[PDB]
Design an enzyme around this catalytic site. Structure first.
Site, PDB file in Angstrom:
ATOM      1  N   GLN A  25      -6.166 -17.454  -3.633  1.00  0.00           N
ATOM      2  CA  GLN A  25      -6.222 -16.627  -4.873  1.00  0.00           C
ATOM      3  C   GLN A  25      -7.456 -17.037  -5.681  1.00  0.00           C
ATOM      4  O   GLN A  25      -8.239 -16.125  -6.044  1.00  0.00           O
ATOM      5  CB  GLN A  25      -4.907 -16.680  -5.665  1.00  0.00           C
ATOM      6  N   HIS A  61       0.835  -1.233   0.000  1.00  0.00           N
ATOM      7  CA  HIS A  61       0.000   0.000   0.000  1.00  0.00           C
ATOM      8  C   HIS A  61       0.858   1.266   0.000  1.00  0.00           C
ATOM      9  O   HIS A  61       0.726   2.105   0.862  1.00  0.00           O
ATOM     10  CB  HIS A  61      -0.970  -0.012   1.148  1.00  0.00           C
ATOM     11  N   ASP A  84      -8.285  -0.511  -8.338  1.00  0.00           N
ATOM     12  CA  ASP A  84      -7.638  -0.886  -7.082  1.00  0.00           C
ATOM     13  C   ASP A  84      -7.176  -2.339  -7.124  1.00  0.00           C
ATOM     14  O   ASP A  84      -6.155  -2.629  -6.465  1.00  0.00           O
ATOM     15  CB  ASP A  84      -8.598  -0.683  -5.935  1.00  0.00           C
ATOM     16  N   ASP A 120      -5.106   5.770  -1.134  1.00  0.00           N
ATOM     17  CA  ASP A 120      -4.555   5.010   0.040  1.00  0.00           C
ATOM     18  C   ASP A 120      -3.563   5.885   0.823  1.00  0.00           C
ATOM     19  O   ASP A 120      -2.689   5.339   1.469  1.00  0.00           O
ATOM     20  CB  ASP A 120      -3.875   3.704  -0.394  1.00  0.00           C
TER      21      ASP A 120
HETATM   22  C1  LIG Z   1      -4.751 -10.116  -5.206  1.00  0.00           C
HETATM   23  N1  LIG Z   1      -5.403  -9.163  -4.307  1.00  0.00           N
HETATM   24  N2  LIG Z   1      -5.544  -7.845  -4.712  1.00  0.00           N
HETATM   25  C2  LIG Z   1      -6.117  -7.216  -3.698  1.00  0.00           C
HETATM   26  C3  LIG Z   1      -6.400  -8.086  -2.627  1.00  0.00           C
HETATM   27  C4  LIG Z   1      -7.117  -7.710  -1.360  1.00  0.00           C
HETATM   28  O1  LIG Z   1      -7.797  -8.553  -0.759  1.00  0.00           O
HETATM   29  N3  LIG Z   1      -7.029  -6.436  -0.939  1.00  0.00           N
HETATM   30  C5  LIG Z   1      -7.462  -5.970   0.384  1.00  0.00           C
HETATM   31  C6  LIG Z   1      -6.183  -5.121   0.442  1.00  0.00           C
HETATM   32  C7  LIG Z   1      -5.917  -5.486  -1.030  1.00  0.00           C
HETATM   33  C8  LIG Z   1      -5.966  -9.386  -3.096  1.00  0.00           C
HETATM   34  C9  LIG Z   1      -5.885 -10.735  -2.431  1.00  0.00           C
HETATM   35  O2  LIG Z   1      -4.868 -11.401  -2.481  1.00  0.00           O
HETATM   36  N4  LIG Z   1      -6.966 -11.147  -1.700  1.00  0.00           N
HETATM   37  C10 LIG Z   1      -7.139 -12.321  -0.947  1.00  0.00           C
HETATM   38  C11 LIG Z   1      -6.148 -13.278  -0.748  1.00  0.00           C
HETATM   39  C12 LIG Z   1      -6.493 -14.407   0.034  1.00  0.00           C
HETATM   40  N5  LIG Z   1      -5.762 -15.467   0.404  1.00  0.00           N
HETATM   41  C13 LIG Z   1      -6.714 -16.141   1.185  1.00  0.00           C
HETATM   42  N6  LIG Z   1      -6.347 -17.298   1.785  1.00  0.00           N
HETATM   43  C14 LIG Z   1      -4.936 -17.681   1.630  1.00  0.00           C
HETATM   44  C15 LIG Z   1      -4.531 -18.643   2.705  1.00  0.00           C
HETATM   45  O3  LIG Z   1      -5.397 -19.769   2.736  1.00  0.00           O
HETATM   46  C16 LIG Z   1      -6.725 -19.356   3.072  1.00  0.00           C
HETATM   47  C17 LIG Z   1      -7.301 -18.384   2.065  1.00  0.00           C
HETATM   48  N7  LIG Z   1      -7.916 -15.591   1.330  1.00  0.00           N
HETATM   49  N8  LIG Z   1      -7.769 -14.472   0.555  1.00  0.00           N
HETATM   50  C18 LIG Z   1      -8.689 -13.487   0.340  1.00  0.00           C
HETATM   51  N9  LIG Z   1      -8.403 -12.444  -0.390  1.00  0.00           N
HETATM   52 MG   LIG Z   2      -7.385   1.190   0.442  1.00  0.00          MG
HETATM   53 ZN   LIG Z   3      -5.651   0.623  -2.833  1.00  0.00          ZN
END
Ligand SMILES: Cn1ncc(C(=O)N2CCC2)c1C(=O)Nc1cc2nc(N3CCOCC3)nn2cn1
Ligand SMILES: [Mg+2]
Ligand SMILES: [Zn+2]
EC number: 3.1.4.17
Length: 313
Positions: A269, A68, A217, A107
């Protein structure tokens, strides 16, 4: 007055594509942003001296966190530039001005922690802003910088144009709270399918700009696979630090935030592409057909995450 910003040929061409990567040379990012304001907005939108001063105060108020950061701000503004250039005639002069600035500022002074962690830590910002905590803070930081001597890039707008642009920016920045995205996209889905969607309805425009903000974003998922994969490392570096801090408060973090659950990243992912990204770019593409390359790039990266799970990388 007669001064174009210009870029080297490869950048000049590639900056127009949705999947463009602003590169590792930090000192070129301001020039990349001004290039995009001049071509999106015109060389007369902003006093160049004021713009430069505003950009450098914005940069100084982004922190050196893994994801960020100043590079994210400029990446999110390039995706908006791509959308604005591919839907030239759908947006007002004020929206073109406001939205690129919204994206650069969205941000400001982020610390690398979710609204959730601020509320569990009992951070002062969580008492000032009970919901969209960081996002109200980012808008507040934007207004602070606009009020620095020599920083008001909007100074030569009417009193009521000025109020409209700051309202475009406030809503655009609030809409980057992903808690708000789910219900916003559902309403946009219903309105587009029942045929009620109406870009003359101000509250419809608002909703559509909110989705555009979520799309910009999230734009790391729309890049060449190597950019997408390396960006995911910076994203998880924050999430796992947040998990470490949750454990210091005596709280089991959600799995997303637990570095002991590294093994499950590919499946997380998949969840994210299916629950958030794909639906976001799908609804965006139905409302603004020339944004299809974001949907297509997202689907290609989902299929790369599927390959990672099947051992094929
Ligand atoms: C690619 N990207 N761009 C933005 C975001 C995102 O969220 N924002 C909020 C600030 C930026 C994500 C992102 O990875 N999101 C994301 C990743 C993720 N990994 C898991 N896990 C892994 C471990 O095992 C359990 C599930 N749940 N999960 C839920 N969401
Ligand atoms: Mg933000
Ligand atoms: Zn952002």
């Amino acid at each position: 007055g007669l001064m174009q910003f210009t870029l080297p040929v490869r950048l000049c061409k590639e900056i127009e594509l949705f999947h463009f990567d602003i590169g590792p040379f930090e000192n070129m990012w301001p020039g990349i942003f001004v290039y995009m304001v001049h071509r999106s907005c015109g060389t007369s939108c902003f006093e160049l001296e004021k713009l430069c001063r505003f950009i450098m105060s914005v940069k100084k108020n982004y922190r050196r966190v893994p994801y960020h950061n100043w590079k994210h701000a400029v990446t999110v503004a390039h995706c908006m530039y791509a959308i604005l250039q591919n839907n030239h005639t759908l947006f007002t002069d004020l929206e073109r001005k406001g939205l690129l600035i919204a994206c650069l500022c969205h941000d400001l002074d982020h610390r690398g922690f979710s609204n959730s962690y601020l509320q569990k830590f009992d951070h002062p910002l969580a008492a000032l802003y009970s919901t969209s905590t960081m996002e109200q803070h980012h808008f507040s930081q934007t207004v602070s910088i606009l009020q620095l001597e020599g920083h008001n890039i909007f100074s030569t707008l009417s009193s009521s144009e000025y109020e409209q642009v700051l309202e475009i920016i406030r809503k655009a920045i609030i809409a980057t709270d992903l808690a708000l995205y789910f219900g916003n996209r559902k309403q946009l889905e219903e309105m587009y399918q029942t045929g009620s969607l109406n870009l003359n309805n101000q509250s419809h425009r608002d909703r559509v700009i909110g989705l555009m903000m979520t799309a910009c974003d999230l734009c790391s998922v729309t890049k060449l696979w190597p950019v997408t994969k390396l960006t995911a490392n910076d994203i998880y570096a924050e999430f796992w630090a947040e998990g470490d801090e949750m454990k210091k408060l005596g709280i089991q973090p959600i799995p997303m935030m637990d570095r002991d659950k590294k093994d499950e990243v590919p499946q997380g992912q998949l969840g994210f592409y299916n629950a958030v990204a794909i639906p976001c770019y799908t609804t965006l593409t139905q409302i603004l057909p020339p944004t299809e390359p974001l949907l297509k790039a997202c689907r290609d990266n989902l299929s790369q995450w599927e390959k990672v799970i099947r051992g094929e990388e």
